[PDB]
């Protein structure tokens, strides 16, 4: 369904639709609010579902995946020139662990979007976001500040979820719309254990494979540096189709955050260098047009930025306030915006393609799609270039 030799992918991430994060929907969150006062906001959408109670959260979350991206979504998806998505899912959509305060209904909406991407000629990976325990203790794996994936039982749980997914959409019903399933979304490797993180991703590869199923196996890099992963799941071993996801930032640390928008670029392009030694197959699949660490919450709830020098000892660089809005920002930011957007596609472009992190947000134009395109920083057609050949490949 999808030629990874000689096709680009052109995608966007469904973030923000079936694992909740605060800054992506704030109007969520910002309830448990008493007055400035962010104490009692729950972190995650464990606390937040917990906070809730059954009833309340199944309630609020059939409106949210109703309406946060519907048919129409898809639609406009393809009138842009994509041609893909990304979904991300948690594992509590397919299985609880006993006392978990997760609600269901997911897999309903899952299985609509795969028919709107089908009637939409769009192709999709499927992500699982969040695993038992949580896999980086980051707010967007369900679990905020908690890194027991590879305790107790979690591993084994994380590989029945995975079968569940493989029996359902590693098959021959959607074999002409999902072309990847990514095992698990940026398990931190620098906290776990990379031999067992290893076996984990060759149990799922050969559980997979096992059903009979031809999917491609979509594995993130774990962090580690450009080339760890070329001797890992080889065509020398008989393990086959298999994809390396990357994702890439300039936001989480003071010392990203204070580079000129000259040495940005730089880095955005030598990502497409590096990229291009690589033995797989690859893919950017996440990444944005932030130059700030501005948006509310986006470090976590109750957490301020590195760019006003707010967090993680960082030194102020400038005020976020100005920033938060779009029709606010200055000339000068608006086109280092697009010459940023413009190198990182061409770098991402030089292997797989690239996948944005994400279509929408309610507020935080850094990290949508939309905002930016209907601004006029994000190239459409995608191919649009006002700083053509940044990066100098060839
Ligand atoms: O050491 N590391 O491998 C590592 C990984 C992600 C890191 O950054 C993480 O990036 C994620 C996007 O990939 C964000 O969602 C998290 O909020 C952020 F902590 C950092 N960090 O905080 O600078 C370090
Ligand atoms: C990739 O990073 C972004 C920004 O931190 C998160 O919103 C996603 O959930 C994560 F997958």
Same mark, same amino acid.
């Given at each position: 369904?999808?030629?990874?030799?000689?096709?680009?992918?052109?995608?966007?991430?469904?973030?923000?639709?079936?694992?909740?994060?605060?800054? @992506?929907?704030?109007?969520?969150?910002?309830?448990?609010?008493?007055?400035?006062?962010?104490?009692?906001?729950?972190?995650?959408?464990?606390?937040?579902?917990?906070?809730?109670?059954? $009833?309340?959260?199944?309630?609020?979350?059939?409106?949210?995946?109703?309406?946060?991206?519907? $048919?129409?979504?898809?639609?406009?998806?393809?009138?842009?020139?994509?041609?893909?998505?990304?979904?991300?899912?948690?594992?509590?959509?397919?299985?609880?662990?006993?006392?978990?305060?997760?609600?269901?209904?997911?897999?309903?909406?899952?299985?609509?979007?795969?028919?709107?991407?089908?009637?939409?000629?769009?192709?999709?990976?499927?992500?699982?976001? /969040?695993?038992?325990?949580?896999?980086?203790?980051?707010?967007?794996?369900?679990?905020?500040?908690?890194?027991?994936?590879?305790?107790?039982?979690?591993?084994?749980?994380?590989? #029945?979820?995975?079968?569940?997914?493989?029996?359902?959409?590693?098959? #021959?019903?959607?074999?002409?719309?999902?072309?990847?399933?990514?095992?698990?979304?940026?398990?931190?490797?620098?906290?776990?254990? @990379?031999?067992?993180?290893?076996?984990?991703?060759?149990?799922?590869?050969?559980?997979?494979?096992?059903?009979?199923?031809?999917?491609?196996?979509?594995?993130?890099?774990?962090?580690?540096?450009?080339?760890?992963?070329?001797?890992?799941?080889?065509?020398?071993?008989?393990?086959?189709?298999?994809?390396?996801?990357?994702?890439?930032?300039?936001?989480?640390? /003071?010392? $990203?955050?204070?580079?000129?928008?000259?040495?940005?670029?730089?880095?955005?392009?030598?990502?497409?260098?590096?990229?291009?030694?690589?033995?797989?197959?690859?893919?950017?699949?996440?990444?944005?047009?932030?130059?700030?660490?501005?948006?509310?919450?986006?470090?976590?709830?109750?957490?301020?930025?590195?760019?006003?020098?707010?967090?993680?000892?960082?030194?102020?660089?400038?005020?976020?306030?100005?920033?938060?809005?779009?029709?606010?920002?200055?000339?000068?930011?608006?086109?280092?915006?697009?010459?940023?957007?413009?190198?990182?596609?061409?770098?991402?472009?030089?292997?797989?393609?690239?996948?944005?992190?994400?279509?929408?947000? $309610?507020?935080?134009?850094?990290?949508?799609?939309?905002?930016?395109?209907?601004?006029?920083?994000?190239?459409?057609?995608?191919?649009?270039?006002?700083?053509?050949?940044?990066?100098?490949?060839?």
């Amino acid at each position: 369904a999808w030629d990874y030799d000689n096709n680009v992918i052109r995608g966007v991430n469904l973030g923000g639709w079936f694992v909740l994060e605060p800054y @992506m929907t704030p109007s969520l969150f910002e309830p448990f609010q008493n007055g400035n006062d962010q104490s009692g906001v729950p972190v995650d959408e464990y606390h937040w579902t917990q906070t809730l109670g059954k $009833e309340a959260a199944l309630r609020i979350l059939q409106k949210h995946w109703s309406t946060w991206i519907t $048919e129409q979504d898809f639609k406009q998806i393809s009138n842009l020139g994509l041609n893909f998505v990304r979904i991300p899912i948690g594992y509590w959509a397919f299985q609880l662990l006993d006392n978990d305060p997760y609600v269901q209904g997911q897999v309903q909406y899952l299985e609509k979007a795969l028919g709107w991407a089908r009637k939409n000629n769009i192709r999709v990976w499927i992500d699982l976001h /969040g695993a038992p325990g949580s896999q980086n203790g980051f707010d967007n794996s369900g679990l905020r500040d908690s890194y027991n994936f590879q305790n107790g039982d979690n591993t084994q749980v994380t590989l #029945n979820v995975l079968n569940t997914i493989f029996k359902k959409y590693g098959g #021959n019903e959607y074999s002409d719309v999902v072309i990847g399933i990514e095992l698990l979304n940026e398990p931190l490797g620098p906290v776990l254990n @990379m031999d067992k993180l290893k076996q984990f991703f060759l149990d799922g590869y050969n559980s997979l494979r096992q059903t009979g199923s031809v999917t491609p196996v979509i594995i993130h890099d774990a962090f580690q540096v450009f080339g760890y992963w070329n001797n890992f799941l080889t065509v020398a071993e008989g393990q086959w189709n298999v994809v390396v996801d990357h994702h890439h930032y300039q936001v989480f640390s /003071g010392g $990203e955050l204070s580079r000129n928008i000259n040495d940005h670029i730089s880095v955005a392009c030598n990502w497409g260098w590096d990229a291009k030694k690589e033995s797989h197959w690859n893919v950017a699949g996440e990444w944005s047009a932030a130059l700030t660490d501005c948006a509310k919450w986006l470090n976590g709830v109750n957490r301020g930025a590195r760019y006003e020098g707010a967090y993680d000892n960082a030194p102020y660089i400038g005020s976020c306030q100005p920033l938060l809005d779009i029709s606010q920002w200055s000339d000068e930011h608006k086109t280092d915006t697009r010459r940023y957007i413009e190198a990182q596609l061409d770098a991402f472009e030089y292997t797989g393609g690239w996948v944005f992190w994400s279509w929408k947000t $309610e507020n935080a134009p850094e990290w949508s799609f939309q905002t930016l395109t209907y601004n006029g920083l994000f190239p459409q057609p995608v191919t649009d270039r006002q700083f053509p050949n940044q990066c100098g490949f060839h």
